[PDB]
Ligand binder design. Sequence first.
Ligand SMILES: Cc1ncc(COP(=O)(O)O)c(CN)c1O
Ligand SMILES: [Cl-]
Ligand SMILES: [Cl-]
Ligand SMILES: [Cl-]
Length: 415
Amino acid sequence: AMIIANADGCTPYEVARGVTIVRGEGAYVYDAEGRGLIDLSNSFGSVMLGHQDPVVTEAVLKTVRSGVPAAASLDLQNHLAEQIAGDLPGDQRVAFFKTGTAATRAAASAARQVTGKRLIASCGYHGYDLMWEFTPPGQPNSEDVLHCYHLPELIDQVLDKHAHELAAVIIAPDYIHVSPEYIADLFERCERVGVVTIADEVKHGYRLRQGASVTEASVVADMYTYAKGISNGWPLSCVAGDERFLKPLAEFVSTLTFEAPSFAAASATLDRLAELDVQAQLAIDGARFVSEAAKMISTRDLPIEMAGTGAAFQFVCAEEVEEVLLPHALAEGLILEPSDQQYPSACFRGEVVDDALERLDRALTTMAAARPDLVGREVTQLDRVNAAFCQMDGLPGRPDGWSLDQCVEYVTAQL
Ligand SMILES: Cc1ncc(COP(=O)(O)O)c(CN)c1O
Ligand SMILES: [Cl-]
Ligand SMILES: [Cl-]
Ligand SMILES: [Cl-]
């Protein structure tokens, strides 16, 4: 009777609200009529290996059938921490949580404890907690967090005004609409004035490479947060970082922080990502998908542009165009996430990619025939900016011809 209060919100599979998903296996989910759909949501990117991965499933099932209680499997817990710490440069300790929001709030709390300072600066989305609620540039939210929307000019403003008062800056990286060098510059500006940095890798950690995405962008951070990439859909997250920041998290423990099934899933997941060369293969397979998708769009003269590549790409279009693309893709058995990147898994390889392209080709054909008025429409700068803001929760640099004031006005109007 709408008794659940937080069902409406940022849940995946909104495009499929008119259908009923009952099964998942590999690259596919299946509806109640037995129809298979290629899944590019993958529980908002939490499923990096594929649904019902055989190795993850056997590890979980063995742990469930042992009945071993929480916090008794010390070797497994420490092994997982060693796996995570060993993929980061430096000497990290690891504190485990159950959601990405818990991990980012804990990292912020650790910075506050060490520095004795309160204010936090932020780029991107860090979770549902009120401390991560977006407010206009220069306006601290109810928990003393300032939002900079990935603009170096807005970072500079906060640093020029509060750098001596900042406990930390927390940046969720993204590379679809900006370069690795652009992201690195955001971190470096804060580093140069001595501000603690948190790389929020909840989305991209273990997706783009076997470790933190920022490492390949020539960035090091004081703490890193992970969740989606590490556990194939099981509820586990962490803060990994330098000892001086991880020591204040010693008592950040819940009754079920160490429930065994999720640790078994995560340790198996990290091993399988390495064994199957997942991120490097996705870079190849996703690049092929995005190139061929772009060609299909072009021959059909539809107002869509592909952005990104590999494991993180996006169908850039106006909202009213996306609202046609998504149902038409669903009708052809292809689940796309709206107003975001797509999230292919390790099973998005081989014949699955060709299957997805065939379904997209059919969807583009029906879309052009159902909505001939969209054929030949141009994609505008505003379309591109809107799509970036939806995807990365910030601006992809100051758009051409926009003043900083226009950027601030635009972001304010999105809230
Ligand atoms: C970049 C990033 N940071 C943190 C979070 C919050 O994590 P969670 O949804 O697991 O609470 C999310 C959403 N998963 C995210 O995309
Ligand atoms: Cl599959
Ligand atoms: Cl939690
Ligand atoms: Cl800029």
